[PDB]
Amino acid sequence: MVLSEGEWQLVLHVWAKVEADVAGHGQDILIRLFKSHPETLEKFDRFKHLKTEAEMKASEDLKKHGVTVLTALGAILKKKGHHEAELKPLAQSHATKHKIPIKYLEFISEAIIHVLHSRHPGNFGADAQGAMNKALELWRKDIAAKYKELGYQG
Ligand code: HEM
């Protein structure tokens, strides 16, 4: 799979809006992930004690991590598919240290799409959402291939 330049433009256009408030978007996305698929929170020993959305919103540490997550993803998206170097450390830690199955990367992709759809309707219409999904599917495809090379393919 390969995105067209037009599709990358739709992806980077909405991401530029996300970048106006990376911490806010990171919070919304991680919270949406934990609420929609609670089992994913169990993978974070650092955050699994958080019981409610209120506690999650109040956690400065979770906000910091959300910034770290979206900044790493933004760097990958900005490579427009040429993300082999960026994917290596991410795939290694998530496959070997954190043990995050592809299914959970699908769940966070769903959360990212939900939050962008909610916050940026004008810049996240059907075509833009389709382009973002394509970019995230490409990332997941390549991450899954790297997982397999690393001995996890989970
Ligand atoms: C858009 C997808 C994601 C990105 C870009 C991402 C990025 C990162 C980054 C940059 C770090 C810090 C450095 C590292 O350990 O590699 C990290 C740590 C971690 N990630 Fe992810 N991650 C993603 C999805 C997930 C998901 C879905 C889970 C769990 C279901 C997960 C669980 C973890 C855990 C447990 C850590 C360590 C947290 C800590 O204790 O500090 N990640 N992630």
Side-chain angles (χ1 to χ4, degrees):
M1 61 184 294
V2 176
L3 278 75
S4 68
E5 171 65 11
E7 291 171 326
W8 283 117
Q9 290 168 181
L10 295 173
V11 171
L12 296 174
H13 178 57
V14 70
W15 200 257
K17 301 310 173 197
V18 168
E19 291 182 327
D21 176 25
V22 183
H25 287 78
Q27 285 175 301
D28 289 358
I29 286 167
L30 289 178
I31 287 174
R32 155 49 64 141
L33 172 67
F34 299 152
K35 290 199 315 190
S36 297
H37 306 278
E39 65 267 39
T40 59
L41 178 58
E42 298 312 309
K43 284 290 184 177
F44 293 83
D45 293 328
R46 172 174 175 197
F47 303 123
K48 64 184 183 186
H49 63 285
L50 299 168
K51 306 186 177 290
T52 59
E53 169 164 9
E55 290 186 351
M56 289 172 198
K57 289 184 180 172
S59 172
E60 203 61 24
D61 196 45
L62 183 61
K63 180 192 297 76
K64 306 294 191 51
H65 189 58
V67 170
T68 291
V69 171
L70 297 191
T71 295
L73 180 64
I76 285 164
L77 297 172
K78 287 170 185 176
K79 292 307 286 289
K80 299 162 59 179
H82 292 93
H83 53 224
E84 32 288 320
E86 291 76 11
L87 252 56
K88 287 180 182 180
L90 183 69
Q92 180 173 54
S93 66
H94 287 59
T96 311
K97 182 180 299 107
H98 313 315
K99 285 80 159 192
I100 310 306
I102 291 291
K103 180 55 58 175
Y104 289 7
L105 296 185
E106 284 169 6
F107 296 158
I108 202 175
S109 295
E110 170 183 56
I112 288 163
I113 284 167
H114 172 92
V115 171
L116 304 200
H117 171 78
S118 302
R119 295 179 66 144
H120 303 289
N123 292 310
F124 209 61
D127 292 336
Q129 180 172 327
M132 178 62 75
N133 177 58
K134 194 169 172 178
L136 296 177
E137 293 191 332
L138 172 64
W139 159 68
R140 291 200 309 274
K141 178 184 177 291
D142 291 351
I143 278 285
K146 188 63 65 171
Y147 269 13
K148 184 178 183 300
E149 286 170 31
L150 294 167
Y152 177 59
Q153 187 46 74

